[PDB]
Amino acid sequence: PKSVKEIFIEMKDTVELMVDLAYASLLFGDKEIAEEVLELEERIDLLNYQLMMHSVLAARNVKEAEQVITILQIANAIEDISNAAGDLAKMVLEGVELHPVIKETILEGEEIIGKIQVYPESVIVGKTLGELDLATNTGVWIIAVRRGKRWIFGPNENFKIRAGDVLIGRGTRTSIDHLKEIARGAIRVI
């Protein structure tokens, strides 16, 4: 038996990832990332359905119905951000020629998206994301990892980095360049 909070947290955590990937796919014109986004859009509809199922069954009296509505209302805004993400994804899958200012805009905002190469020498090779907490210890958020021909989306704390992995992360420009050097093996301390 899942809780409303459980379901709700995954919705928020998933849509945050979806918006990040929609931008990743636009920047790299990557159709596989774009397709991950639409799969996630489905999971959101499924989570929202379940949130409604729990919510509806839970209101006993008037005051509680009133509250259960504030939840649906928020899940609705999350729902709208999810479809918006899907929209950006479709543009990539459609294969339309993107105006150059789009990729530059994603690389020059307060928070950009960056691609990081991991070298054999890097002090992070062998460390899990959990152990590392780059989000925590570097402000760079790892949203995906291209390990050869495969993609690991929304990797967890168990995921262990290998030389050759290409980290896809979000953070400030400075956060990303820094992290890149830690990955070339230029910076031996994290």
41 binds, among a copy of itself, Cs ion, none (CB under 5 to 8 A by kind): Cs ion
Identified binder of a copy of itself from the candidate list 56, 96, 123, 186, rule CB under 8 A: 96
Which spans in the chain are helix H?
4-28, 31-58, 62-93, 101-107, 129-132, 134-138, 173-184
Asked if 155 interacts with a copy of itself (CB under 8 A), we say: no
Asked if 188 interacts with a copy of itself (CB under 8 A), we say: no
**Short-list 158, 156, 154, 190, CA closest to 169:** 154
Give strand pairing partners of 168: 115, 144
Residues 6+ apart with CB under 8 A from 133: none
Q: Smaller CB distance to a copy of itself: residue 19 or 118? A: 19
Is 45 labeled as ligand-binding? Answer: yes
Identified binder of Cs ion from the candidate list 2, 121, 164, 184, rule CB under 5 A: 164
Q: At what angle do helices 31-58 and 62-93 cross, to 10 degrees?
A: 170
Asked if 47 interacts with a copy of itself (CB under 8 A), we say: no
Identified binder of a copy of itself from the candidate list 135, 163, 166, 190, rule CB under 8 A: 135
Q: Are 56 and 48 in contact (CB under 8 A)?
A: no
Give the nearest distance from C-beta 126 to a copy of itself in angstroms. 21
Is 164 labeled as ligand-binding? Answer: yes
Give the nearest distance from C-beta 161 to a copy of itself in angstroms. 18
Residues 55-84, mask of contacts with a copy of itself (x by CB under 8 A): --------x--xxx-xx-xx-xxx-xx-xx
Residues 6+ apart with CB under 8 A from 56: 68
**Hey, which bits of 101-179 come out as E strands?**
112-117, 141-147, 150-153, 166-171
- Summarize the annotated binding site for Ca(2+) as residue ranges: 45, 56, 59, 79-80, 149, 164
